[model samples]
Target chain A: DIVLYYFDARGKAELIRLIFAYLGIEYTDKRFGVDAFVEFKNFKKEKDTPFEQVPILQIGDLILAQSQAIVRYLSKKYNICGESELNEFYADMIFCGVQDIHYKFNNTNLFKQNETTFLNEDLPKWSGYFEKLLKKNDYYFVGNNLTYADLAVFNLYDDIETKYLNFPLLKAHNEFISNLPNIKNYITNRK
Target chain B: DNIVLYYFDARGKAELIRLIFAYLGIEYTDKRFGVNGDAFVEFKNFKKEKDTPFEQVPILQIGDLILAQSQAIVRYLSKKYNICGESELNEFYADMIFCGVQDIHYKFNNTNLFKQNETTFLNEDLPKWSGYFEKLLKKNHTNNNKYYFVGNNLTYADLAVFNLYDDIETKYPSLKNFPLLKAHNEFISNLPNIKNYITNR
Candidate 1:
């Protein structure tokens, strides 16, 4: 009994979709185009939403807002988060750090957008930090061991800046993601 | 009091901590400076000040623990104060509102937030942010309600709503624009403990 609302884009909602895909969770995924957005805007204008953004997850009667909150809820529900307190701290710090990195989908050449802030400030800061983390360890952001979570979350679509974001660690991690259990098992079965 | 909150002395993001401490009857050093002045310049530069974990502000010190970001601090305090939420679901609900507080607060604080184009500003820009919180506040209250954002008690989420409302007032003098938020301000500021703190201080 889970319903999610976001645009048709793979934006923030895609990570959630990826987690659900790997975890074998069933959900109703609704995507809207420009017209739907027009309708959704006023609908959005009048909700008890947090931080006033979307990728809202409606669980039964409970409606949850905030993209990161949704991600954490799913992460814990499925045990994709690591084990133990230290794991929790590293996981928490990294998860929060990741969100802190790309908290919003970049308008990076959006509608045809760059050096203003995302390029000048936010990208370099997070990219450098992420590079350090990956290099330090194989750095699976989800499981304590390298698991499909890296594949699902780090599937950053190849776009302008994202194309340039292939740090060595991400490149190596990208190798593991290509070998996800879900993809190989996709031939074996459905969750 | 082992808790020390650092910031420039304005009801910036740190005001939520002040209000929470006041409500819970906890005492901590009320550390702040005069809002980004020559006296406050060094602290503003986290690189120069060199205390920020990720180069951000309103750093909170709890014994040996240090936390940053206003939402993270409020979340930590909410857990410590035991007012985060009574139910598990309520905790999630509170997080959403807490993040909402950060979202609106960030945009209003962003230098390039309100651009020169009035259409887009009025169209989706302002409403998406303000309208979202108006509903958040509305949902927290009755047409005349006292129930908090979650569980039947005051969680850290309530303080965040109050602080954001306060931010809008300080930055934008005409409060009439947001009726629901204005009502929430009236409701929260008049609570016995909060009122006493505001009056006594």
Candidate 2:
């Protein structure tokens, strides 16, 4: 009875999908092509999406929009946030930081002409912070355990694994997350 | 005792957090860098890369943690104060509203660098959002005369909308189409601490 809607590619909805995978929760992963989503948004206004955007999570009659909102809700509901309020704060901080870097790299024109600058300077500037976090905390990003923050880092570097060798800890972290029993199959099967 | 906020002197990204603090009377140092000169230099000289991954301003320092991202900080404070919302659904609403406001804020930030047509944004995009907020407020009034975006109490959702209104009302003063938003604006602005902060600052 739970459904997630987004484009077919793993753009923003991947985090939510990853969380569901980690939790071993069964839900419908409904996807659309980019143009299909636009058409649906325009035509299916009756769906009553609050923001008229996706990745939207529909739980029974309640509908929630915004990728971060869905991720945060799922993270909190599954107790994957962290140990305490402070740990959760740290997790939230990392989520936003990842989002800042993620959107800039993917959504902006920074990748248009200057791949060198992004690979060398921009990406490393952000990746270095995560590396230090992993080093200081012993691989996991926030607390002593695997929080959603780790999932976020995994998702960030999963596709760009080739460029992440500069951060050995993150490379290890990525491997560690991808090999987890709950997530290993998801990684292997995901398109 | 070291709950301090760092941002530029202007009431840009830090203003909503400031308003939240003012509303709750939460005590925190508001450290600001100047628009130019030695103060800005001092901010630039601060070891920000270590503190913030993005090397952005509006970082909040609490105890040993340095939290970055304005929206994250705002949400943290909102959660800490129990002002985010009463339930999961309400919190989701608050998050959605805050992100909506941030979407506009980001577009506004790109005005200069992207050569954004400010006139079109003001005439088109701004009104679209303003009307959306107004419709939301109206829907609430259809609930308790509550006028809040979510739940029965004052959440960050109301504050986020108020901040948007505060930031743009001067530029787009014509709100005849958004009577509820205008009234909500007056309602939030006149709250004792917020009013005092606006007046004294």
In candidate 1, chain A reaches a TM of 0.71
**lDDT (10s digit) by residue, model 1, range B73-106:** 7787789889889888889989988887777666
Model 1 CA deviation exceeding 4 Å by range: A1-191, B34-37, B44-52, B111-124, B136-144, B173-180, B196-201
What tens digits encode model 1's per-residue C-alpha lDDT throughout A1-191?
Answer: 68887766566676777777777788888665635436456657855566556667888878888666777777777776667666656666776665555443343321111322555576766667767776665257544574333634365522233423446676666556645676345324522
Which pairs of residues collide in candidate 1?
A: A50-B100, A51-B100, A109-A113, A110-A113, B9-B33, B142-B145
Off by over 4 Å in 2: A1-191, B48-50, B112-116, B170-173
Top candidate on TM-score is 2
Tens digits of per-residue lDDT, candidate 2, B1-201, equal: 688888767677788889999999989998876545554355557644446767666778888788887788889889999999989988998898888888886655544211324445665787888877877776666454737888788998888888877776543335677888888878888889999999998
Candidate 1 chain B, run of 10 with poorest lDDT: B110-119
Q: Calculate model 2's interface RMSD in Å.
A: 13.1
Supply candidate 2's per-residue lDDT for B143. Answer: 57
Q: What is the lDDT of residue A20 in candidate 2?
A: 95
TM-score of predicted chain B versus true chain B for each candidate? 0.76, 0.89
| Every model's DockQ | 0.01, 0.01
